[PDB]
Amino acid sequence: METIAKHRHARSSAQKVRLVADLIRGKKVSQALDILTYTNKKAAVLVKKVLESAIANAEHNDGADIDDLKVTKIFVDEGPSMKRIMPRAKGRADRILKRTSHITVVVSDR
């Protein structure tokens, strides 16, 4: 059985989030949680919250027994960007991009 949780419009660049994503691709959830517990990155918190939500979804809606789940799929996409202005010397102006991302995690008893 497949269960999905998502986080959309997360405030972080996708390149920075992809580094944490592949640390847990294909692991059992029990060890993935404690791996995410001891990485000193901002994105680890977001990924951990998404993973816990997915586990809760799988346990409540569909069948139980979180003791046999694995991380089957996980990927990060790019969301919309916000544009701002930063002044530079001699009266020039520059464009600043504030990038976001979407996070998807799939867990499965199989």
Binding site: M82, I85, G91, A93
Partner: peptide, 26 residues
């Protein structure tokens, strides 16, 4: 809340440089 708006500024530049000697001057 959760709705965002902005504008732009385009005054470009105001040349007048190259204060050093000419490349292949007289």
């Amino acid at each position: 809340v959760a709705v965002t708006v902005y504008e732009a500024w385009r005054q470009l530049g105001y040349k007048g440089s190259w204060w050093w000697p000419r490349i292949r001057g007289p």
